[PDB]
Amino acid sequence: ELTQSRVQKIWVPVHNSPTVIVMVGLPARGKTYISKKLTRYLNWIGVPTKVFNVGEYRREAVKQYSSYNFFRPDNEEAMKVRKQCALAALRDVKSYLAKEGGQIAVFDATNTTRERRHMILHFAKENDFKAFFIESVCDDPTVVASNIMEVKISSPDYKDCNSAEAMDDFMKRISCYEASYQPLDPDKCDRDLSLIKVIDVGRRFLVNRVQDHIQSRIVYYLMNIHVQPRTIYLCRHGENEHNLQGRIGGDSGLSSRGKKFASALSKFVEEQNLKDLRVWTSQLKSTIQTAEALRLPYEQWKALNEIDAGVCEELTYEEIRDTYPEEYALREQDKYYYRYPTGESYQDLVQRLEPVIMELERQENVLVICHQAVLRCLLAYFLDKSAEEMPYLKCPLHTVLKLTPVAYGCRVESIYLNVESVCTHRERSE
Ligand SMILES: Cc1coc2ccc(-c3cc(Nc4cnccc4S(C)(=O)=O)cc4nccnc34)cc12
Numbered sequence: 001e002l003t004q005s006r007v008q009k010i011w012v013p014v015h016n017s018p019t020v021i022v023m024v025g026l027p028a029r030g031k032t033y034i035s036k037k038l039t040r041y042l043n044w045i046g047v048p049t050k051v052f053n054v055g056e057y058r059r060e061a062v063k064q065y066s067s068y069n070f071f072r073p074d075n076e077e078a079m080k081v082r083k084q085c086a087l088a089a090l091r092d093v094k095s096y097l098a099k100e101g102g103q104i105a106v107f108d109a110t111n112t113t114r115e116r117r118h119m120i121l122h123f124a125k126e127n128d129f130k131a132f133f134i135e136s137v138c139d140d141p142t143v144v145a146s147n148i149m150e151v152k153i154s155s156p157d158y159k160d161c162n163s164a165e166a167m168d169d170f171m172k173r174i175s176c177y178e179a180s181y182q183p184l185d186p187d188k189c190d191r192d193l194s195l196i197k198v199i200d201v202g203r204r205f206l207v208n209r210v211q212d213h214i215q216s217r218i219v220y221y222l223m224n225i226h227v228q229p230r231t232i233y234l235c236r237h238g239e240n241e242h243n244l245q246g247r248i249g250g251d252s253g254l255s256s257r258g259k260k261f262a263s264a265l266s267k268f269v270e271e272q273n274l275k276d277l278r279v280w281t282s283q284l285k286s287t288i289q290t291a292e293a294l295r296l297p298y299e300q301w302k303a304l305n306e307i308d309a310g311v312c313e314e315l316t317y318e319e320i321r322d323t324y325p326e327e328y329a330l331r332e333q334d335k336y337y338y339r340y341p342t343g344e345s346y347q348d349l350v351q352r353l354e355p356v357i358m359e360l361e362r363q364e365n366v367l368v369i370c371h372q373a374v375l376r377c378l379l380a381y382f383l384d385k386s387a388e389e390m391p392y393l394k395c396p397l398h399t400v401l402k403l404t405p406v407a408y409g410c411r412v413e414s415i416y417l418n419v420e421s422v423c424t425h426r427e428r429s430e
């Protein structure tokens with residue numbers, strides 16, 4: 001005896017264990033880059049995840065950074081402070097996982113000693129949390145130097161000292177950790193832990209005892225990402241006939257303005273002067289027509305097809321409000337989770353866009369020509385926007401969104417190609 005829920009259209013009867021991810025490694029080995037990127041992916045696929053960076057606890061507890069002397073192993077007092085910052089971060093990890101509905105807590109510190117990791121194990125074991133270790137190993141001076149230049153010298157620790165002095169201070173800071181650093185030893189003393197040791201910026205991996213699906217998924221993700229420079233371009237199909245009529249969904253062709261956009265996109269792409277640009281479309285006509293103007297090879301993906309409005313397909317928003325007034329209201333109230341009847345939600349979109357994201361990570365220069373709701377979902381991933389926000393991100397017609405991975409984030413530049421269109425943006429209601 002069953003009833004269908006109003007928002008998600010789920011039939012209900014009418015009368016999982018959380019994980020602490022423990023980063024491991026010397027400073028400037030990309031621990032925080034990984035922490036952030038992973039946390040972005042996990043949240044976007046609907047696994048609530050949060051980073052606890054001990055460094056930030058240390059920054060909060062102590063006046064202002066003066067020098068690497070603070071990190072000296074003989075600094076008996078800084079050691080007490082560091083350890084207390086760690087325990088405070090863990091206190092917050094407990095609260096996040098046990099009481100705030102967090103699923104994954106990423107404990108982002110050096111955690112270079114067996115003793116420290118042993119304390120974290122004990123903390124996890126006694127709260128029924130699983131523990132999963134990720135160690136980044138790299139002994140290439142160039143990579144380290146570049147890491148320091150790119151994100152360290154610019155940190156708030158170093159505002160009073162810049163450049164040569166910061167670079168110099170950071171190298172000595174690193175050397176403070178070298179003597180007591182005990183790498184993960186899966187061969188022997190760590191043979192029973194679940195871990196991945198990543199070597200040389202993802203060149204090789206050593207993976208030991210994957211316990212569950214999240215961990216195998218993390219490993220798969222780590223095996224697909226890369227740090228080569230590249231650019232990702234996202235846009236919609238040129239304006240189509242249904243856009244002109246205010247009609248949603250469907251498989252209409254480009255308007256005359258849509259075709260002018262396509263010519264302009266072609267011009268824009270040529271002027272970007274890229275090598276080996278891959279082009280991806282949906283299987284819907286308007287995106288394919290748009291790519292046809294480019295005179296480049298392209299590949300279609302059913303996963304990039306626009307959200308399926310179900311019974312509302314090909315209707316105007318007005319027609320939907322007149323015909324299905326309660327469905328209309330429910331969508332405006334809960335736009336991410338709402339499923340159209342016999343159709344999709346934004347939540348469903350994320351599931352089928354996941355392999356698009358994973359292939360995007362593998363690629364270099366890519367242009368993705370897609371549809372409004374799909375574009376928002378992808379944009380949310382790259383820009384770390386939440387589920388509640390995703391459905392309202394702005395992605396105008398005839399506008400290219402040019403994304404450039406930077407460390408810890410993504411530059412976004414909008415480039416409108418000066419071809420008029422209607423506006424299909426609909427802001428949050430009531
Ligand atoms: C790819 C990949 C898969 O697993 C990884 C683990 C670490 C890193 C990583 C990423 C990384 N990125 C990074 C770190 N700090 C500042 C800038 C960057 S970057 C290269 O601009 O994105 C630097 C690293 N340095 C030493 C070892 N690993 C680094 C990359 C990968």
Ligand SMILES: O=P(O)(O)OC[C@H]1O[C@](O)(CO)[C@@H](O)[C@@H]1O
Nearest residue numbers: 248249306309371372373424426
């Ligand atoms: O989630 P929203 O704001 O209704 O936008 C998705 C709609 O946008 C369009 O791509 C253009 O109106 C429709 O095909 C689709 O139903």
